[PDB]
Amino acid sequence: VVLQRRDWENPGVTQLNRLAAHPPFASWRNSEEARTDRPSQQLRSLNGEWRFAWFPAPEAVPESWLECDLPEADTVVVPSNWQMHGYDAPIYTNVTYPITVNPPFVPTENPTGCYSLTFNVDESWLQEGQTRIIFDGVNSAFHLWCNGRWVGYGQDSRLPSEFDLSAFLRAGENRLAVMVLRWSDGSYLEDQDMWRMSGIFRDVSLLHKPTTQISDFHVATRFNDDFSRAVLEAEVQMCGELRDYLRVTVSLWQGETQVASGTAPFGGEIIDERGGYADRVTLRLNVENPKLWSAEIPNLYRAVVELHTADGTLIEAEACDVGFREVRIENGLLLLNGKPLLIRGVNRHEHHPLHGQVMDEQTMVQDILLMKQNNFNAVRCSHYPNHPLWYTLCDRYGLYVVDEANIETHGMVPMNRLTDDPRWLPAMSERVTRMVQRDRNHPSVIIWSLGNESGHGANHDALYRWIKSVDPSRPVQYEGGGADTTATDIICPMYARVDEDQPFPAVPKWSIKKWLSLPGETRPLILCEYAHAMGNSLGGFAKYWQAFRQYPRLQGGFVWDWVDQSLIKYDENGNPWSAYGGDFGDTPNDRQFCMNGLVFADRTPHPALTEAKHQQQFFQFRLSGQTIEVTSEYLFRHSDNELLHWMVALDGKPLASGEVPLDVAPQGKQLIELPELPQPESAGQLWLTVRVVQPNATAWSEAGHISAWQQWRLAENLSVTLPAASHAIPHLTTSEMDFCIELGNKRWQFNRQSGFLSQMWIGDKKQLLTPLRDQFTRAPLDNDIGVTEATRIDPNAWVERWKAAGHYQAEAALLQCTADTLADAVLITTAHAWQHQGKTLFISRKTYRIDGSGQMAITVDVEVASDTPHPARIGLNCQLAQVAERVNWLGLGPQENYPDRLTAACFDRWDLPLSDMYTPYVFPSENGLRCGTRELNYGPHQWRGDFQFNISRYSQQQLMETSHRHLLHAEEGTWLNIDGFHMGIGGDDSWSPSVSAEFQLSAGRYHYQLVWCQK
Amino acid sequence: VVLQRRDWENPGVTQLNRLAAHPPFASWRNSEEARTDRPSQQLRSLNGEWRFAWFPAPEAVPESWLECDLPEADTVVVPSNWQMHGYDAPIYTNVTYPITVNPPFVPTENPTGCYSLTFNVDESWLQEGQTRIIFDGVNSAFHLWCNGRWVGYGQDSRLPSEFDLSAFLRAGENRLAVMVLRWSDGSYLEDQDMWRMSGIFRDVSLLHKPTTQISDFHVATRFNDDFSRAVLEAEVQMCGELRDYLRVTVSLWQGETQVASGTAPFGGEIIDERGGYADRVTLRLNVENPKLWSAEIPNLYRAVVELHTADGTLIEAEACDVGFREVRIENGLLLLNGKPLLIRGVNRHEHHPLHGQVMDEQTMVQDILLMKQNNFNAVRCSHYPNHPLWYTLCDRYGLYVVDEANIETHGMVPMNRLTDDPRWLPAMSERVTRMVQRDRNHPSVIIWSLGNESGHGANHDALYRWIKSVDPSRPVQYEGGGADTTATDIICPMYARVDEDQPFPAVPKWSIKKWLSLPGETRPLILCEYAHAMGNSLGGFAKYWQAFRQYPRLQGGFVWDWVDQSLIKYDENGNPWSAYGGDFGDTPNDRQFCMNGLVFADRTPHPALTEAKHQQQFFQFRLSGQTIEVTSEYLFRHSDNELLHWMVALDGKPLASGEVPLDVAPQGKQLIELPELPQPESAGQLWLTVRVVQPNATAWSEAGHISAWQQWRLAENLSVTLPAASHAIPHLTTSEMDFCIELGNKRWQFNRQSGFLSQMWIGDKKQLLTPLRDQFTRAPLDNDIGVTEATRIDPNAWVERWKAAGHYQAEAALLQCTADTLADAVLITTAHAWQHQGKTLFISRKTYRIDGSGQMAITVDVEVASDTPHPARIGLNCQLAQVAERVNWLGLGPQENYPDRLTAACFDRWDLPLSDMYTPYVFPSENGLRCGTRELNYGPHQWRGDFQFNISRYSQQQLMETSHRHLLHAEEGTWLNIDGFHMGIGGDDSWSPSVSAEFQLSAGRYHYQLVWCQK
Ligand SMILES: [Mg+2]
Ligand SMILES: [Mg+2]
Ligand SMILES: [Mg+2]
Ligand SMILES: [Mg+2]
Ligand SMILES: [Mg+2]
Ligand SMILES: [Mg+2]
Ligand code: NA
Ligand code: NA
Ligand code: NA
Ligand code: NA
Ligand code: NA
Ligand code: NA
Ligand code: NA
Ligand code: NA
């Protein structure tokens, strides 16, 4: 029957004998345990070692397994993904389905995981009531047997499947057998851009309920106009025998204090001509001056639902955290408790580099802490309902949640092929309705989502309306089919740009500013995905936030995404390394596209996280003369844990500082008058830095946490006083092959055939391993590469334009190399043409001026052919002989910053170990640049000017040629790139060019100057 | 597998291996055949004799039956309901489910019909392409086998279930085996108020399609503002291998004239980021000055869809009738082709008294013709999709159709228990979606309905939105949950009254006039059910029509209902009689509530049909002096088949008549000035009668068809001239027991103990069989009875009020009986009191004046206690000794008419056989009354006055005591009821008092007078 019916190839069968969905239950038999959320004896964990055997297909599974353990089976931790134990490979594919697209059919070779457990059940559980098993997550479909008897079947990898075991269990020893199929008709609705894994990957539990039981309960909170009064409504449903003595009590608690209570017999109001629900009751509780829930202040109450007899005997209790909040859209604005939200959101997948898609409390809390510490207030469950603990943590720590149905059919052609088909409506409906039934009592959930990337079909409209009917308290959003369809309350595009239209046929991505004002359009716009953080990315992040702050109806977005989906693999010595698509023999695959995180898989931040934190700041600053105006972007809280530190420094040297407590009302302003500062004697630029510091620890941060910063240039005194003329004069020695400049112990050698500074000597010590040469290219970033392949070139990608133009292949041709003696200096003049196939790409004209002080002044003037693709950089590079421990610079830092991602960086004197000047992106690229640098110190060297630089033990060539960071090897000496100019990194998306025009090197002619000396 | 899975007790399983729903297909392989709608060689009927065996449960079916005919099986006609063949009892229950309410479970005793067929298949059908079987209707669930091999399973009794037999069939002889279950989880959605039957009750057919095929096609018609231009859009879908040489042509035909044609290869427009549908194409055809479809003028075009190769080789053709019409709601009005409809509708069940629920073309045509002849323009498919031919006939004859999903869960408590439950969303969705997929191309379908009497649940909202999304061309309506929910475009209440509110909790039925203007309400209102035509009913029909005409947003309604659901049974003599609920041993049952029709089951009209025809007239009339103003209520057609006949008569005697051609524009007026009419010499009332006559036959009516009529009183000349005094003088003979009056061969006898005229003689011949006595009661009508039972009294019902007050048991007490001699007459004076348990209900005071002419003038003055329930009638009753062939009267006729149902009746001289003065309602009651009667003649008797009367061979007692018409026996002589006053019959509904105040006998004191003589 089981093998014959092939229920995993039938979208009309999504379950057999599965119990109804409901909010989290524990069946407390003690009301106080329910109130305080203590463990329940009635809810037992089956998270232990199970027996496991892997089979190539369900047809290969022996019947004996239903009754007896297989001798060949292993013992494995559950929950787990069986790919993480090496039974087969995880597959990373983005859009293209991992299986042949032939719905509802799956491959005959269908990896089958056979799980079994021998466990004890006490007779007390079987003498009365109902024992159910709960599988919180099984990927992707499964049949269940208990003591050799078939119980049921379930689909949807991301919601709990529950089965009544009461008639299957015996007192003492029992055996569960779970046959998990990797592929099913459900897989067609599970095409999310993530590792394709399988197994029992969320908690398994047994729950005992009385025969007369709470089967469901819904909590709603409605408010008056100023939120000074609330009514809590709790609808409670029961199963079992109705009796006149049965009662439901709902009590509301603020910590230790009961603030309200209501008791009633069963029997709801008259619904229609046939009467009402005899098995339901609604309790209504008045609450005066409720403490309101928000991400700013996650005030929670506890609702306890008691099923009991009239004479006071408890039957069972259930409970939930209640957050008093109202979500509504009014006049085109998403409002929370009457105030317009600004969503500082991020998309978060459930990913662990060791455990795959198994989530633990520690990792969840780590993520939430890091999110809040980085000024995020919102998370999107991309793209499925999460582990149930996630919502409880968001309730308590305070994050806004978009809860999203496990529906993605991205690889279909067209994308709505299944979602417009009524035969797939039953399957889709269950993914939506069962999510709502599970999660509707969580205050952190403020918006429902119908899924992701599934086009727009009639099934979406139907389910949109279903949600609106059953839960009017939350807007519904859905991006598919152009982001502004009839199935969405919120214009929720993915990767729509700030100012630039992308007018794709049928599904255009308008500029977000333009989108709001399209004829007839009135809805708020919140990007469901934006700022694709793949590798060295988040270029132009500030452009979004400027727009969000300027336009009331631009209410923010969710960054894509939180965490790199890299997996751990081990070399021959047991050393771990980060792996991406293809590293497991998985093919076809989408390589490094699984890594789009603000943090690495181990939760180490990428540099881009600081840019996010800064732009998402909750305090805004203006400077007018002596006054600092601080504006609060908080909606609800006063600044009762905030003090402003200010500091004035002259080229990094502190001259004055102080602190002022912040006392700013939500949306309010505070004016801070700086004391009159002394004018410094020496020349240079004065810089003001302010930082907002939280003196007191919170649930989510340590004492001294910095939440905001800003800088301004103050007075500048230009250096006019001439350097005292040195007595020494350098001498020029000329040969046919070289110009040699000597200043006592110092030598500079210019090769006359190449025209470059080929060597520098400090006595007998060589300073260079490679000549100082112009560089116009960078080891391409993920954004430069996009979706290009060796198999299939994308001619539009920056890297392919640079390659085709011969930028990487261009050879320098010497046009001019001359040497002149001045009164106190030697002047070397050079000109080079970079050419490819007879076409001149760049001309570099340089002067090197070496004077008696031993300083080499380099002037560089570059022409770039207007018809060549704009170059990645305009700079110099060399391999220095020296390897020094520290890098010291006066410029923007401390972290990596690029021209379109430098707002978070502060101008100061920074000092880091060399290793910190390299960013270990899993896929190597140009990295570690610091911009706006006026002075750089490394070993014996000092460079001064106004430049961008990176410094590391890796050449651009090696970074370009190496696909994985763990394969990089430190080269001899140190590679230095000093750029007059560097192209933006972009990141609006990572599959088309996204570097904004103002950050492309299009000026045609470029000038920079450097001074190189020994310090 | 089949027995173990129990798919019929699982709402998650509505089918197995069933093909997608689609519009009617025939797979023509010739384009001209498709165009002319001739039979297709590729569509074969399996409507022949099948083998049938009945079993008590599916478990009792022998395995051998899959392979071999059961010798004990019978050869039966298919389509059929097996109850109609006597294999088990049909069940009539209204609301209460015929099975224990325990979803999704059905009784273990589940009647099972085993159908089988040995049939031949042509070799050519199997050599190429696809052979499918189509079951148009199987009640209620079935498994299918072919040549012993299991094919599939299907639910939903009212839509076709189709299965691919290509892999199952052999050339030559094949055997189908169909196991049909009476009860399934589907039964929970099929609780319509009708006989509960089962079997293969609609067509079975085989369809051959090519491998490369048209799998679906949708036709839409859009118009400019004045409907002078149209675009026909045809979306065509294919299945099979796509080839670049494939083409679709859509040609549109107006009769023999091709109007437009378009050809394209496959490949739709880009839909989303993944492209478009490669397997679809949309053709757009321009149509100048299209002939528009309406019920008034059902103009049709033919659309032919050809799948072919580029070189011109036809693969296959499909086709449909196209009606160019637009249905929209604008400014609160339902518009067809820009004009506001007035729905003259009726609910029609599919019912045949011999064949049960099997429909045939002849009966359908008979129904449509009778509907249109009686001024109906609309039909509601209560409460399920109809036999596919129904829509074709409505397309061609011109009726507006409400197509309704097969969803009714009336007996649930509360009514929305299933429809609000997401577990039942899949089963409900299929009932809606598969209906739309089948019927969306029919122009006659103007409104979609979500089902009937299933409360209002979130599933309704989802499916409402689904329809609105897939088909914006038709409004969606649904009555459940109060008739004005978010799941309806039209306020569509059932049995809402005209002026009287019925403020039921949660689901009030407001006055329809009041409902329209409720705060915020803007929608049109069309009653989905009104004017419950159960038995002697349709009292107050005129009140609805007056309101419909006065209020723009009251756009009519659908009468409940077309045809009595009586069934034919046979008594000992083999004689057929009409049976209702309970007559098959079915229990519980709802007795005569299955009979609510305007026509008897054999399509003979009830008297109420004429009231409907008259009120639904399309011409309105006013009289002013000599001028008749005729107003047309047609929206589209001119009166191009109409003339007006007028007639003026003095008390039934013709004086003048004439004919005038009608030339009225739609919504226009025509003024007709009557010629100078000669003044009548003799006394009496002149009456003007006009009739609209259709001189020419149509598709739906005969030459001479009368479509409308109206009457007015003109001049009246009151009789002032004294009758010449007769020389004869009556003599009074007085005894202790009697007063006797003699006048020649005539005698009148008044019993002095009873106080009534006990006998009259013409010579020696007795005239009376019972004395002439007052009567205050009637044999109760269905409307008087309502839902009352002997086991459960409804004290509110009229009959129970009359019974409780002792009206039926009240005995006449003589207060006074005196005789006096006048100058030329004898005067008998009587007074009676009717009393029950010491309470005086009625007092009757009479004078009988017998003069020399042999005339007896009776004056009656009645007092009715203000605190007794108002009596059903105030009149006289006697059993006449004579039985005469004819009844002749001057008054309202010719048909039965009552005070609240007499607008259709005309004043004239009528002459009918006695049998026509009895209405054979299947449930006997007071019947055959004629109102406004000034003269009545029967045998030697004449009664003059202003009275209502009925006359028949049945006493009120027998009518009241006899449950079925076939059990009535003509009594000796003739029963005459002559009423001064008679209570209305009501009928707004038939479960609560529905007689309007103005038709209740509440005046307290009543006067009437009669003259009894011998003409
Ligand atoms: Mg399935
Ligand atoms: Mg995707
Ligand atoms: Mg800044
Ligand atoms: Mg079923
Ligand atoms: Mg009903
Ligand atoms: Mg009239
Ligand atoms: Na904004
Ligand atoms: Na990705
Ligand atoms: Na503060
Ligand atoms: Na690389
Ligand atoms: Na009207
Ligand atoms: Na009925
Ligand atoms: Na005419
Ligand atoms: Na009767």
From Swiss-Prot, chains A, B:
<dbReference type="InterPro" id="IPR006101">
    <property type="entry name" value="Glyco_hydro_2"/>
</dbReference>
<comment type="similarity">
    <text>Belongs to the glycosyl hydrolase 2 family.</text>
</comment>
<feature type="binding site">
    <location>
        <position position="408"/>
    </location>
    <ligand>
        <name>Mg(2+) 1</name>
    </ligand>
</feature>
<dbReference type="InterPro" id="IPR036156">
    <property type="entry name" value="Beta-gal/glucu_dom_sf"/>
</dbReference>
<keyword id="KW-0326">Glycosidase</keyword>
<feature type="binding site">
    <location>
        <position position="453"/>
    </location>
    <ligand>
        <name>Mg(2+) 1</name>
    </ligand>
</feature>
<dbReference type="Pfam" id="PF00703">
    <property type="entry name" value="Glyco_hydro_2"/>
</dbReference>
<dbReference type="InterPro" id="IPR013783">
    <property type="entry name" value="Ig-like_fold"/>
</dbReference>
<dbReference type="InterPro" id="IPR023230">
    <property type="entry name" value="Glyco_hydro_2_CS"/>
</dbReference>
<protein>
    <recommendedName>
        <fullName>Beta-galactosidase</fullName>
        <ecNumber>3.2.1.23</ecNumber>
    </recommendedName>
</protein>
<keyword id="KW-0479">Metal-binding</keyword>
<dbReference type="InterPro" id="IPR011013">
    <property type="entry name" value="Gal_mutarotase_sf_dom"/>
</dbReference>
<dbReference type="InterPro" id="IPR050347">
    <property type="entry name" value="Bact_Beta-galactosidase"/>
</dbReference>
<dbReference type="GO" id="GO:0000287">
    <property type="term" value="F:magnesium ion binding"/>
</dbReference>
<dbReference type="InterPro" id="IPR017853">
    <property type="entry name" value="Glycoside_hydrolase_SF"/>
</dbReference>
<dbReference type="GO" id="GO:0005990">
    <property type="term" value="P:lactose catabolic process"/>
</dbReference>
<dbReference type="InterPro" id="IPR006103">
    <property type="entry name" value="Glyco_hydro_2_cat"/>
</dbReference>
<dbReference type="InterPro" id="IPR008979">
    <property type="entry name" value="Galactose-bd-like_sf"/>
</dbReference>
<feature type="binding site">
    <location>
        <begin position="529"/>
        <end position="532"/>
    </location>
    <ligand>
        <name>substrate</name>
    </ligand>
</feature>
<feature type="binding site">
    <location>
        <position position="94"/>
    </location>
    <ligand>
        <name>substrate</name>
    </ligand>
</feature>
<feature type="active site" description="Nucleophile">
    <location>
        <position position="529"/>
    </location>
</feature>
<feature type="binding site">
    <location>
        <position position="593"/>
    </location>
    <ligand>
        <name>Na(+)</name>
    </ligand>
</feature>
<dbReference type="GO" id="GO:0009341">
    <property type="term" value="C:beta-galactosidase complex"/>
</dbReference>
<feature type="binding site">
    <location>
        <position position="589"/>
    </location>
    <ligand>
        <name>Mg(2+) 2</name>
    </ligand>
</feature>
<comment type="subunit">
    <text>Homotetramer.</text>
</comment>
<dbReference type="Pfam" id="PF16353">
    <property type="entry name" value="LacZ_4"/>
</dbReference>
<feature type="active site" description="Proton donor">
    <location>
        <position position="453"/>
    </location>
</feature>
<feature type="binding site">
    <location>
        <position position="453"/>
    </location>
    <ligand>
        <name>substrate</name>
    </ligand>
</feature>
<dbReference type="GO" id="GO:0030246">
    <property type="term" value="F:carbohydrate binding"/>
</dbReference>
<feature type="site" description="Transition state stabilizer">
    <location>
        <position position="349"/>
    </location>
</feature>
<dbReference type="InterPro" id="IPR023933">
    <property type="entry name" value="Glyco_hydro_2_beta_Galsidase"/>
</dbReference>
<keyword id="KW-0460">Magnesium</keyword>
<feature type="binding site">
    <location>
        <position position="410"/>
    </location>
    <ligand>
        <name>Mg(2+) 1</name>
    </ligand>
</feature>
<dbReference type="InterPro" id="IPR014718">
    <property type="entry name" value="GH-type_carb-bd"/>
</dbReference>
<dbReference type="InterPro" id="IPR004199">
    <property type="entry name" value="B-gal_small/dom_5"/>
</dbReference>
<feature type="binding site">
    <location>
        <position position="193"/>
    </location>
    <ligand>
        <name>substrate</name>
    </ligand>
</feature>
<dbReference type="InterPro" id="IPR006104">
    <property type="entry name" value="Glyco_hydro_2_N"/>
</dbReference>
<feature type="binding site">
    <location>
        <position position="991"/>
    </location>
    <ligand>
        <name>substrate</name>
    </ligand>
</feature>
<feature type="binding site">
    <location>
        <position position="596"/>
    </location>
    <ligand>
        <name>Na(+)</name>
    </ligand>
</feature>
<dbReference type="Pfam" id="PF02929">
    <property type="entry name" value="Bgal_small_N"/>
</dbReference>
<feature type="site" description="Important for ensuring that an appropriate proportion of lactose is converted to allolactose">
    <location>
        <position position="991"/>
    </location>
</feature>
<dbReference type="GO" id="GO:0004565">
    <property type="term" value="F:beta-galactosidase activity"/>
</dbReference>
